[PDB]
Design a protein around this ligand. Structure first.
Ligand SMILES: CO[C@]1(C(=O)O)C[C@H](O)[C@@H](NC(C)=O)[C@H]([C@H](O)[C@H](O)CO)O1
Ligand SMILES: CO[C@]1(C(=O)O)C[C@H](O)[C@@H](NC(C)=O)[C@H]([C@H](O)[C@H](O)CO)O1
Ligand SMILES: N[C@@H](CCC(=O)O)C(=O)O
Lengths: 167, 161, 171
């Protein structure tokens, strides 16, 4: 399964650790994504990183890259960039709170969490990760947008973020 | 009890300059000896939408039992989500009282004013600046004659108990 | 009940970077599901830590393949479970539940971007002196490790403010 849930009853939702690409940004299996969401009271503590492995991911054409995990209003996964687009518990306990992070609110500052990091861990390549909560007009979502450098390989190091949950 | 928060809301709940001029989110969740905290602050009325100063500070102060004494919230809404208060207070050995100036009492966050990439700002979260009891202080950079809004951010500190 | 590995909060130097007890380190790791939430800060107290000779400073905690601590910069290696989190004498715990995942953060992988977590902060909290903390997972070729490297300013005191980071665990 692409996203899997693990007990403390479910306390972790993650992409299982892998040594191989598990994600499709531009072409199939072109990248290795880690995404892990763990519940701590009203918070989800999230970690994310994304390593380019093949194709355009190793020779970027654009100055940013975005992916999104979208869920319906019950918290069921609808879509993700994962090669294994599947899921295998109260899902709303992991969804971003829709009162605080209003649906369709990507333009609202409080729906966005900004992280400074460095492309490929190179300090001469500062980039910014924007994590957005509930950009989707219905249901729930988590969006990740990183800046990038054209004609260079993409890799975003380990990062983390936190949001308040729906339940 | 794992969470202390101001409950999620979409209407103003906070008073920085005038009553109910802003929407504050502050949530503290306990994970062992840590509190994981999140905060954001959105201006909605008055000077918060047309700033007069280039920084904005708010503070939550608590007594030596962990009871809230003062905050900028319009109503007494900082509460247990629907208990030992000291398990949520910043550790007073590591973060000495009256320690606003001590580096280890301060936690820095980089963000962007109104999420605008031309407006990088710093948030300084300070533990136990108060001379007695406990405190959490937040100070953000701002730009005069512009609206203030600080995006979602987070921080982490070690607890007293 | 055991959720925390730490060096205890103290007001006295507890750490040796260049000379014995020259610094005050805080390091605390708390488990939340498949994550560790970590906090760290480092304050120079004496000697070269108050008058730096180099432009970066690094310390490392190494562990064996069971998660047992092998080396650290702490005087007497005072890094263990938080007292009072269990009523049992000599409480047991799964140390691998605190170790950085070795599939995601491969051993000897310090050159791999996903093994590194970058934090911006300010030297001595002076906002004119931005510095970068690099936390590296499993740099060591064997066992597990957490490495911390801060940039520094020569001929000045070193102190890094409160910071935090997060990684996925082995178990
Ligand atoms: C003397 O100038 C400074 C410094 O060292 O650069 C300015 C800096 O903003 C300040 N840090 C904070 C968090 O206030 C620091 C501490 O007060 C001092 O290091 C404590 O000993 O003093
Ligand atoms: C070629 O130089 C660089 C790069 O890519 O810019 C420098 C950068 O500091 C380094 N990152 C780290 C964490 O060391 C990176 C990786 O080692 C390499 O990309 C992995 O394949 O190599
Ligand atoms: N120096 C502080 C107290 C000790 C500290 O902050 O470390 C004060 O003058 O209140």
């Amino acid at each position: 399964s692409g996203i899997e849930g693990r007990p403390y009853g479910i306390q972790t939702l993650w992409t299982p650790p892998t040594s191989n690409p598990n994600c499709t940004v531009y072409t199939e299996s072109d990248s290795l994504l880690s995404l892990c969401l763990t519940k701590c009271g009203a918070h989800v503590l999230g970690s994310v990183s994304l390593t380019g492995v093949a194709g355009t991911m190793t020779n970027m054409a654009e100055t940013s890259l975005a992916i999104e995990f979208t869920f319906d209003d019950t918290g069921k996964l609808l879509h993700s960039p994962l090669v294994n687009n599947t899921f295998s518990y109260n899902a709303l306990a992991f969804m971003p709170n829709s009162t605080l992070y209003a649906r369709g609110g990507s333009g609202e500052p409080r729906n966005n969490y900004y992280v400074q990091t460095y492309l490929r861990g190179n300090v001469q390549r500062p980039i910014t990760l924007t994590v957005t909560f509930n950009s989707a007009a219905t249901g729930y979502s988590l969006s990740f947008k990183w800046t990038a450098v054209v004609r260079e390989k993409f890799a975003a190091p380990a990062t983390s973020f936190c949001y308040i949950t729906e339940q």
